[PDB]
Amino acid sequence: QVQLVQSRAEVKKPGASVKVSCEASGYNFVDHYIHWVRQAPGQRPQWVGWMNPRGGGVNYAQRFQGRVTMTRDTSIDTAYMQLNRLTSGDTAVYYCATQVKLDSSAGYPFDIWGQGTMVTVSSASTKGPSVFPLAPSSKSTSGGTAALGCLVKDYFPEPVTVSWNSGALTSGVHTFPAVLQSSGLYSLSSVVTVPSSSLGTQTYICNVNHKPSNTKVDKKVEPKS
Amino acid sequence: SALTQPRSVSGSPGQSVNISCTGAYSGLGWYQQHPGRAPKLIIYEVNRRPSGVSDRFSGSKSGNTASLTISGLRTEDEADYFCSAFEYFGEGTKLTVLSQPKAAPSVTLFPPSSEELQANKATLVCLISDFYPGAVTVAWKADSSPVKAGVETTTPSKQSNNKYAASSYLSLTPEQWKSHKSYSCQVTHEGSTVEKTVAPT
Ligand SMILES: *[C@@H]1O[C@H](CO)[C@@H](O[C@@H]2O[C@H](CO)[C@@H](O)[C@H](O)[C@H]2NC(C)=O)[C@H](O)[C@H]1NC(C)=O
């Protein structure tokens, strides 16, 4: 089976370098150019360059010259791509690709693709979140249901688990996917919908656990003044 | 080599949709891509399928504009589609296969908490849920004037009930929060707007 298999994802500090590997199998490695294509999240693929594994020759896109390095080890059929002095603009999934099973004259386009190597370049360091209540109000309340929640703000990295009253409250809980601020840290909200008449008789705690920073926080969400 | 293709196309199950791509040497490559996966070449040399690619995908080209046609639309087809010419790629076309009734978003807006304000920060939290298709635009208003700074909006994501959810965060300083009598979160979905507003206490 003709395939390319790449190395695991990497989280790098600005200014570091990353070396992504790409092992080919099921065909003759030295016979086909290895192409590297990167794709920033939600953007268009960006061709980085190709490497001729027969003689090691390379051609890089202009905006990477002097910064990218493409090498190969023909004895184990793996190509490498090293990108230096990383910035946040280099955050992307990095693919190796090649043309093998095609009846083509060009060597473009590519029918074999690696699974991708996510490279995230961030200055964020591991940090537990600050939890803030989101209080029920008359603007939340509708038809006897009140919406309350908590704002899990500024943590890194993913994930956090949110639960309510130690998971005793599960019905009506909606935990939203987190946003990544330009700060580099994440924030998410969890909202739970409860009977408004239950308010004041019932106590609602949101439990936040951040295993990476290893914090655990409990915080209550009761009606304001 | 600047290849341009429409931003989005839509269709229902079982019908046909096509995606054009204008630019020099266009149509020499057509890629389909599902989230978290490598691009899958489906068409090459304008009209040829590689082995393993379905009959339902077809290619053609008229003048400067190659067209990718997908017949018998399945929900499997919902994906991003890229044309390519040698090293260069088009910007991409998201294809939305309409698999469920149109559902308007429900919106919830929380003001900054008192504890966040005592820490000299203010976040407004606009929660958008239960909408289909997965596409909203969020605008913020300070009283009546648009606000563009301090806004972070998530891409839509699928809930357990197959509808979509998104959220938007407006970061203010306490003084800006207190110097206006209201802030609004306006969520536009399929050309129809839903607004929610909050006020300093
Ligand atoms: C792509 O699909 C569109 C339809 O969405 C085609 O436009 C239709 O073309 C046929 C043939 O001329 C007509 O019967 C329809 O009335 C057209 N509708 C519209 C709105 O134009 C278009 O021709 C297709 N293009 C290609 C290259 O297949």
Numbering used by the authors:
A (entry chain H): 1 to 225
B (entry chain L): 2 to 202
Q: What sentences appear in the manuscript?
A:
In the past decade, it was discovered that a subset of HIV-1–infected individuals produce potent and broadly neutralizing antibodies (bNAbs) that target the HIV-1 envelope protein (Env) (1–4), a trimeric spike of gp120-gp41 heterodimers on the viral surface. Members of the VRC01-class of CD4bs bNAbs, characterized by IGVH1-2*02 variable heavy (VH) gene segment use and an unusually short five-residue CDRL3 loop, have been isolated from many different donors and revealed to bind with a very similar orientation at the gp120 interface. Here, we describe antibody BG24, a VRC01-class bNAb, that targets the CD4bs with comparable neutralization breadth and potency to VRC01 while exhibiting half as many somatic mutations. The existence of moderately mutated CD4-binding site (CD4bs) bNAbs such as BG24 provides a simpler blueprint for CD4bs antibody induction by a vaccine, raising the prospect that such an induction might be feasible with a germline-targeting approach.
Moreover, the presence of a potential N-linked glycosylation site (PNGS) at residue N58HC, which sits directly at the antigen-antibody interface, may alter BG24’s orientation at the CD4bs relative to other VRC01-class antibodies or reduce BG24’s ability to neutralize HIV-1 isolates. Given that the Env binding orientations of VH1-2/VRC01-class bNAbs are highly convergent, we speculated that glycosylation at position N58HC of BG24 would likely reduce its potency and breadth. Thus, to assess the impact of N58HC glycosylation, we compared the neutralizing activity of a glycan-knockout construct (BG24 S60AHC) and a “glycan-occupied” construct (BG24 S60THC) to the wild-type protein on the DeCamp global 12-strain panel. Because we observed no difference in the neutralization profile of BG24 S60AHC compared to wild type, we used the S60AHC construct to define the Env binding mechanism of BG24 to eliminate potential interference of a glycosylated N58HC residue in structural studies. We determined a 2.0-Å crystal structure of the BG24 S60AHC Fab and a 3.8-Å crystal structure of the BG24 S60AHC Fab in complex with a natively glycosylated clade A BG505 SOSIP.664 trimer and a Fab from the V3-glycan targeting bNAb 10-1074. Unexpectedly, BG24 showed one of the lowest numbers of somatic hypermutation (SHM) of the clonal family, exhibiting 13.4% nucleotide (22.7% amino acid) and 8% nucleotide (19.5% amino acid) mutations in heavy and light chains, respectively. However, BG24 features a tyrosine at the −5 position in its CDRH3, a fixed position at the end of CDRH3 typically occupied by a tryptophan residue, and an uncommon 5–amino acid CDRL3 “SAFEY” sequence motif.
